Amino acid sequence: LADSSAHLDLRNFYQLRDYRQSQAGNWSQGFVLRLQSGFTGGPLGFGLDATGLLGVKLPVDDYSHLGLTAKLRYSQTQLQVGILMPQLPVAFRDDVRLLPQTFDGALLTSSEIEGLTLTAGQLWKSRTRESDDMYIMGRDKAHASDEFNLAGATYAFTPRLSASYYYGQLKDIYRQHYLGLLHTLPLGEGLSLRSDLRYFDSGEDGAAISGPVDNRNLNAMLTLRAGAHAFGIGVQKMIGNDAFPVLNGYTTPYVANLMAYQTFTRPQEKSWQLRYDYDFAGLGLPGLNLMTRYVQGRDIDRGAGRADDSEWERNTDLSYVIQSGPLKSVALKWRNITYRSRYGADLDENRFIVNYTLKLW
C-alpha cells in the first residue's frame, strides 16, 4: 500500500463585493480530502480514490460531500468511475470559488500511441455548493438531462504544434464540437510566441427539451513570452443568437477572454483582451507574480430592437507562494476585479485567497 497517498487541500477565501445596477462581504473555508490508493499489481490494475469536500461559512457547516472513484489501469489506458473533476474543452470543472465543482461519471483515457491521447466519457451529475441533472447554464433546470457524453482526441504533430478535437453531448439538450490548434514558436532565448486558437460549434440535440441552441464561438489567445515578462492579446467572437453553452454549476467556459467575473460569451458579443504577466523571481522575489488583464466587449444582443450592450472588465492578481519558514508552500492571492457595463450591472470586488495542501501520508 506504499503507493497510496492522502492529502488535505485547504482554501481560505475572502471576498468583498460592491455590486449594483451595496458593499457585502464573505469569508469562508474549504477542505478537500484526497485519498488515493496505489494500483493492484499485474497487467490489469485496480485502485480506489476518495474525495471528501467540506465548505464552512465564517463557523457553520455549509456543504459537505463524499465521493469515491474506482480506477482501472492497463498499459497506457485508464478508466475512472465515480467522482470526477474533468478539465476538458467541453467540460472544464469550476475551481475559482471555494470548492471545486465535481461530476459523477465514467472517464476513459488512453495514450497507447505516441503523441496521441484519446478520451471518452459520460457524466451523470454535476455537484456544487448550491436536485441534480445537467442543463445549459442560464436555462430551465426543470428540463434537465442526466447524460453528458464526451469524446476527444489530442495529437502532438510536433513538440511545437498540437491539435485537439472534442465532442460534448448533453443528451436531448445540446451538442458541441470543439477544435483547438496550439502552436508554440521559439523566437530566441527566453522568447516564444504561443498561439492558442479555439473553435466551438454548438447546436441542439435530440428532443431539444430546452429549445433551440445556436452558437459558434471563435476565440484565440496570442501570448509573447519574454524572459520574466509575458504579453498577451485575445480575441473572441460569439456568432448566432445564443450565448456560448456551458454546463450548469458555473462550469468554466474554455475560452480565451474568460475573466474573474464575466466570461464575455453573451449573445453576439465581440471582445478583445490585453494581458500582462510578471514573474518577480529575477528581481529577487521568487514565488511572487503579477497578472493584469483587461477585456472589452461589444455588440451584446439585448433583443427586440434595443441598443446592444457593451462591457469591460479588468483583473489584477498578485500571487505569492511563501518560499520558506513555517508557512512554506502556502499560496496567497490578492485579486482586484473591476467591471462595468452600459445597460447592466457594475462591480468592484477584492478577493483574498489562501491555499495550502497538507500531505497526510
Residue numbers in the entry: 3 to 23, 29 to 65, 86 to 157, 161 to 391
Original paper wording:
Here we show that OprD channels require a carboxyl group in the substrate for efficient transport, and based on this we have renamed the family Occ, for outer membrane carboxylate channels. As expected from pairwise sequence identities that range from 35%–50%, the Occ proteins share a similar architecture, with a slightly off-center constriction formed by the inward-folded extracellular loops L3 and L7 and residues in the barrel wall. The transport data demonstrate that Occ channels have a pronounced preference for substrates with a carboxyl group, due to the universal presence of a basic ladder on one side of the barrel wall.
To determine if the phylogenetic subdivision of Occ proteins exists at the structural level, we determined X-ray crystal structures for seven Occ family members (OccD2, OccD3, and OccK2–K6). The pores of the proteins within the OccK subfamily show a considerable variation in size and shape, suggesting differences in substrate preferences within subfamilies as well. OccK4 was indeed the most efficient phenylacetate uptake channel of the proteins tested; however, the specific activities are very low and, as for vanillate, high substrate concentrations had to be used. Thus, phenylacetate is not a preferred substrate for any of the tested channels.
